[PDB]
Enzyme design. Structure first.
Site, short mmCIF file in Angstrom:
data_model
loop_
_atom_site.label_atom_id
_atom_site.label_comp_id
_atom_site.label_asym_id
_atom_site.label_seq_id
_atom_site.Cartn_x
_atom_site.Cartn_y
_atom_site.Cartn_z
N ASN A 110 79.48 25.26 -26.93
CA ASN A 110 78.45 25.21 -27.98
C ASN A 110 77.04 25.59 -27.53
O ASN A 110 76.27 26.08 -28.34
CB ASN A 110 78.39 23.83 -28.63
CG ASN A 110 79.64 23.47 -29.40
OD1 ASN A 110 80.40 24.35 -29.82
ND2 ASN A 110 79.84 22.18 -29.63
N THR A 163 97.30 55.02 -15.23
CA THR A 163 97.50 54.76 -16.64
C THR A 163 97.95 56.05 -17.34
O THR A 163 97.27 57.07 -17.27
CB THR A 163 96.21 54.28 -17.33
OG1 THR A 163 95.53 53.31 -16.51
CG2 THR A 163 96.54 53.65 -18.65
N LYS A 190 98.32 58.69 -20.28
CA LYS A 190 97.45 59.17 -21.35
C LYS A 190 98.20 60.23 -22.16
O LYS A 190 99.18 60.79 -21.68
CB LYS A 190 96.17 59.77 -20.76
CG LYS A 190 95.42 58.86 -19.80
CD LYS A 190 94.78 57.68 -20.53
CE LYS A 190 94.23 56.69 -19.52
NZ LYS A 190 93.54 55.53 -20.18
N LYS A 194 95.96 57.51 -24.60
CA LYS A 194 96.05 56.06 -24.72
C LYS A 194 97.15 55.68 -25.70
O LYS A 194 98.12 55.01 -25.33
CB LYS A 194 94.72 55.46 -25.18
CG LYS A 194 93.54 55.76 -24.29
CD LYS A 194 92.26 55.17 -24.86
CE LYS A 194 92.30 53.65 -24.83
NZ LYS A 194 92.16 53.13 -23.44
N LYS A 223 101.28 52.52 -15.54
CA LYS A 223 101.03 51.39 -16.44
C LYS A 223 100.83 51.82 -17.88
O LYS A 223 100.45 52.96 -18.16
CB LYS A 223 99.82 50.60 -15.96
CG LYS A 223 98.50 51.28 -16.22
CD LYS A 223 97.37 50.62 -15.47
CE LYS A 223 96.97 49.31 -16.09
NZ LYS A 223 96.63 49.43 -17.50
N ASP A 283 98.73 51.65 -21.23
CA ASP A 283 97.34 51.41 -21.56
C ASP A 283 97.23 50.00 -22.16
O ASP A 283 98.20 49.47 -22.70
CB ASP A 283 96.84 52.47 -22.55
CG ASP A 283 95.60 53.18 -22.05
OD1 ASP A 283 94.69 52.50 -21.57
OD2 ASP A 283 95.54 54.42 -22.06
N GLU A 284 96.06 49.38 -22.01
CA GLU A 284 95.86 48.01 -22.46
C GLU A 284 96.16 47.84 -23.95
O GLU A 284 96.62 46.78 -24.36
CB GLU A 284 94.43 47.54 -22.15
CG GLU A 284 93.34 48.12 -23.05
CD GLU A 284 92.93 49.52 -22.64
OE1 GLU A 284 92.76 49.74 -21.44
OE2 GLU A 284 92.72 50.39 -23.50
N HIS A 311 94.93 42.88 -17.10
CA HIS A 311 93.89 43.76 -17.61
C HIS A 311 92.76 42.92 -18.22
O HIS A 311 93.02 41.99 -19.00
CB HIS A 311 94.50 44.70 -18.66
CG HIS A 311 93.63 45.87 -19.00
ND1 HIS A 311 92.57 45.79 -19.87
CD2 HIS A 311 93.65 47.15 -18.55
CE1 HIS A 311 91.95 46.96 -19.93
NE2 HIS A 311 92.59 47.80 -19.14
N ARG A 312 91.51 43.28 -17.91
CA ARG A 312 90.33 42.52 -18.36
C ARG A 312 89.70 43.02 -19.66
O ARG A 312 88.49 42.88 -19.86
CB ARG A 312 89.24 42.48 -17.27
CG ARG A 312 89.27 43.65 -16.32
CD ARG A 312 87.94 44.39 -16.18
NE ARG A 312 87.16 43.89 -15.05
CZ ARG A 312 86.11 44.51 -14.50
NH1 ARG A 312 85.95 45.83 -14.61
NH2 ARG A 312 85.32 43.84 -13.69
N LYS A 372 83.67 55.58 -14.22
CA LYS A 372 83.05 55.76 -15.53
C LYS A 372 82.52 54.46 -16.16
O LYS A 372 81.74 54.51 -17.14
CB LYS A 372 84.03 56.43 -16.50
CG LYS A 372 85.15 55.52 -16.98
CD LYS A 372 86.20 56.29 -17.77
CE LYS A 372 87.33 55.36 -18.17
NZ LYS A 372 88.44 56.09 -18.83
#
Lengths: 467, 105, 118, 467
Positions: free
Chosen positions: A115, A165, A167, A169, A193, A195-196, A286-287, A326
């Protein structure tokens, strides 16, 4: 005794500002960076943060006197101005061990950041660090496996691991997904992997992807004689779906899955981390969404707190940033929280953003994963920064190799093996990385093509000043 | 420092004082223009000047046209002066404090 | 997911999303929602009233139910756990659930109005 | 480095005797009392104990050099002769936190007392105390409820609670069992209990007893207007049977069950303690078999270690002895481990047998239960020794009341209520207990009859020596 109930509003700092308090080793400590509203003194603002994240509210309640408030209250025990910045302070607050549910990152965050960030009297608030006491750390499972057990399971020693990753995506069918995976893995990458945001969608349902990807892993492993993996994304709408997807990955004999811990949440993540331990499946984390929270330094939660929380909740890998790619990553900060997620004991060091000394009581480390906008020219810097115990991931940097996918894959696989060989021979990856890559480029045309493409602004300017 | 509450409370006090200022203007105008109507408004308004919006709705019940005169003027003053008030109050306070910290502290 | 951390962008804030009706229909949404809730609770004609028990943390289960009973008997529709009240050394969850249920029954019996505690 | 492998037998004390070691707060500490065989030096004997309860064996193995032995080895860091006794020493040994499975008393005991008691080179060995580090204590659930939650559940405040074991130990049918229970409870006792060896037998099957006892509890509670309980014994041959019996008790709405933690074992007990927490059933723990282990001071494990282990495994009550009754209990020792099972922080005090300061990090306390060979004349001493937070149990001291069961029950119920009233009024139970009982005996004939019966050798002798 219970000191009489006097109803009414008091200053928080009368109860919650305790500059003479010395933290116990069982206390959870938090470092907040805050700016008070004009007219609100720093010690009252610090006390308000301590109050409303532990035991207190805006007016005096009689129920306090039924219990021992001294035992339970959060204690703002130190405030210091941020050097060089107007109206910005650090508050250090101690929370008793008793306040927290054992094994619950969800509960810890609910108190510390529940809070107080929206309090009118505070302009901005950013949680910089938490010292997790060893007695609390021991109530958590932590990583299902951790760094050393993972290397042992995968027979991967002596250098960083390499991932990629797939591609685009979104948009590829399951069969085309497995195709891209097979070609990447056969070329020398350890992992590919999802993609997220690849979960289950009209163009590619999850169970089909799992099926076709498993086939790609078997074919590429058979061809190369090295263990291959692909982080199958089990991130799902509900706990039930998440588990259903994790279960099929296990059924297929898949060594590793992935989970978006923040967009799914810590409660689902902690469930998954326990399941992974019981079922011997590695867990890549993955973040996704972290930068919504951790980017600006005036407000939010710094990533190093999120990294600590993830190591507690459970994950075998966690993305750490690249510094050079990037997406944003401060180097000093990064070196700091890479230590926090790998090591057992990390000394306080404000120059790397580590406010508190952190002990982990032999909880396994988490592999940092450097990913995003990196290519071959970055390799020596990445090896220099992260060292051997890391995963370096090249999505566009593999699938974007001028001649297409298979040469793109070979470029990455050659670059990796050249670096591992060099490292093992005693060459310094940081100082010699560019050279190691140039060398390999001499006999690998497809690596040479990639090195050329992503080399990148050079500068170069000029001599006049002749006598 | 509940800052949006304080600002909200401060603006309503400025609005009431500017309504009192407008009432002073209209009153001085009617001093030249309509001395009776001036005497009515001066006696009507004595003690009523508390809340500016309540004063206006109450003056509308008696004389809708004169309420409108005060409405226009309060608003004219506000458009002319309000932009200078921030710098005046901030430097005013800083100067008044600076005096006292000098003699005392 | 990733765009907020992009180097080329200083700051990014998502302001709004229009969810298409075709996507909205793939969700359950509220288990009940406003009108079904009023109907279940027999609560019509005004805002409902609640109350978070304090101190946030530190009260035993029995003292928690005590505070709840006294609040509810006085005319509040609801009381609630603090957001950080989950299960802790000073008050395990199953004990709180037990004592709070007793408080709800006693206060509902006394007042003749439906009571709840989140 | 790994210091070369030299095969062969070395002295333990070369590796495991570390007199300059200072224990960490995460170390588990153990105090052993030992006598070495003639010709075995004390420091070698102490080192052998440390070695063979942690990492070591009788000869040098090369595998040590694969890991970091300094991090893992037990460390005998202090030895002292037992004052006044020939060839007897205390060894203090520190064990790293890493050696132990979280939440497992079974594992802790397997290391500390697994093999070392049978070592040829040692004549006798007795474990006196263990300091459980707070970081380890937090990996355990502990009591399902503990003292304060139990008083709150039962609405029992302001005095010791009263219980009673039904007799004869074995031989009564289920119906006659419930009969004896009803008559005891209606008379003023808070609890009755199965004998420790009442499980399920030809003369009385368990499910029948549970049925008839539940009826007795309802009738007596309805008559008296006080909460009644009976510890239904779920001690069983297997985990499955144990759970089946616990389940039916819950189905009957029974507030409390009992378990023989030592004869059933810690693994079954820890299962039961977790179930009790999840199902809101109180758990009374009987210490059957403990004296096989803890009676003699030259060899075995002292009860205060077993009490600590039980608080970790889980139990709401634990028998503590009486000091004054038919079974042995040293007073100083008893006061010591009663503190260990009740309090949150207990300072080292060798005069009460507490070798180490013990913290419990807010793990609930366990109610001590004084039982065995006690009657009304013992009451003031019992209240004096144990105070309000205890259960005092009278089996023969209730059912053996000259006029039979119902008057026997009334004698106990009156004696209890008289003591609770007196305590609440501020009377000192220790100093005034006999008087409080005499008073009540004035108007209760059945109490008077009991006081007379069990008063007991008096002495009384003589004056001559006249001038």
């Amino acid at each position: 005794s219970a000191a009489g109930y006097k109803a009414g509003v008091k200053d928080y700092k009368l109860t919650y500002y305790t500059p003479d308090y010395t933290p116990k080793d069982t206390d959870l400590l938090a470092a907040f960076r805050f700016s008070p509203q004009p007219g609100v003194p720093a010690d009252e603002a610090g006390a308000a943060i301590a109050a409303e994240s532990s035991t207190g509210t805006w007016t005096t309640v009689w129920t306090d006197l039924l219990t021992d408030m001294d035992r339970y209250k959060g204690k703002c025990y130190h405030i210091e101005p941020v050097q060089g910045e107007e109206n910005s302070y650090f508050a250090f607050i101690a929370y008793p061990l008793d306040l927290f549910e054992e094994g619950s990152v969800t509960n810890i965050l609910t108190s510390i950041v529940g809070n107080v960030f929206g309090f009118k009297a505070i302009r901005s608030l950013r949680l910089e660090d938490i010292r997790f006491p060893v007695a609390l750390v021991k109530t958590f499972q932590g990583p299902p496996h951790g760094i050393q057990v993972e290397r042992d399971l995968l027979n991967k020693y002596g250098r960083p691991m390499l991932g990629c990753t797939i591609k685009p995506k979104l948009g590829l069918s399951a069969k085309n997904y497995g195709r891209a995976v097979y070609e990447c893995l056969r070329g020398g990458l350890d992992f590919t992997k999802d993609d997220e945001n690849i979960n289950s969608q009209p163009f590619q349902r999850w169970r089909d992807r799992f099926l076709f990807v498993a086939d790609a892993i078997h074919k590429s492993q058979a061809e190369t004689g090295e263990i291959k993996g692909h982080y199958l994304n089990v991130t799902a709408p509900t706990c039930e779906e998440m588990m259903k997807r994790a279960e099929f990955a296990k059924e297929l004999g898949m060594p590793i899955i992935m989970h978006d811990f923040l967009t799914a949440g810590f409660t689902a993540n902690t469930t998954l981390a326990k399941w992974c331990r019981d079922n011997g499946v590695l867990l890549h984390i993955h973040r996704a969404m972290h930068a919504v929270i951790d980017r600006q330094r005036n407000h939010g939660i710094h990533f190093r707190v999120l990294a600590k929380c993830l190591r507690l909740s459970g994950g075998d890998h966690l993305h750490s940033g690249t510094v050079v790619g990037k997406l944003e990553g401060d180097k000093a900060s990064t070196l700091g929280f890479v230590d926090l997620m790998r090591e057992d004991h990390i000394e306080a060091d404000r120059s790397r953003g580590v406010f508190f000394t952190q002990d982990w009581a032999s909880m396994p480390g988490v592999l940092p994963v450097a990913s995003g906008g990196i290519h071959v020219w970055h390799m020596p810097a990445l090896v220099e920064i992260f060292g051997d115990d890391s995963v370096l991931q090249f999505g566009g940097g593999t699938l974007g190799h001028p001649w297409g996918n298979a040469p793109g894959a070979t470029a990455n696989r050659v670059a990796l093996e050249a670096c591992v060989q060099a490292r093992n021979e005693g060459r310094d990856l940081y100082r010699e990385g560019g050279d190691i890559l140039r060398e390999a480029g001499k006999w690998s045309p497809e690596l040479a093509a990639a090195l050329d493409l992503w080399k990148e602004i050079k500068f170069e300017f000029e001599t006049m000043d002749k006598l | 420092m509940n800052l949006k509450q304080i600002a909200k409370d401060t603006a309503k006090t400025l609005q009431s004082y500017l309504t009192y200022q407008a009432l002073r203007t209209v009153l001085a105008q009617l001093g030249e223009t309509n001395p009776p109507l001036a005497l009515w408004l001066h006696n009507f308004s004595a003690g009523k000047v508390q809340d500016g919006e309540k004063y206006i709705e109450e003056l509308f019940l008696e004389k809708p046209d004169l309420a409108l005169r005060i409405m226009t003027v309060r608003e004219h003053i506000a458009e002319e002066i309000a932009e200078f008030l921030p710098e005046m109050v901030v430097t005013g306070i800083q100067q008044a404090n600076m005096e006292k910290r000098r003699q005392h502290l």
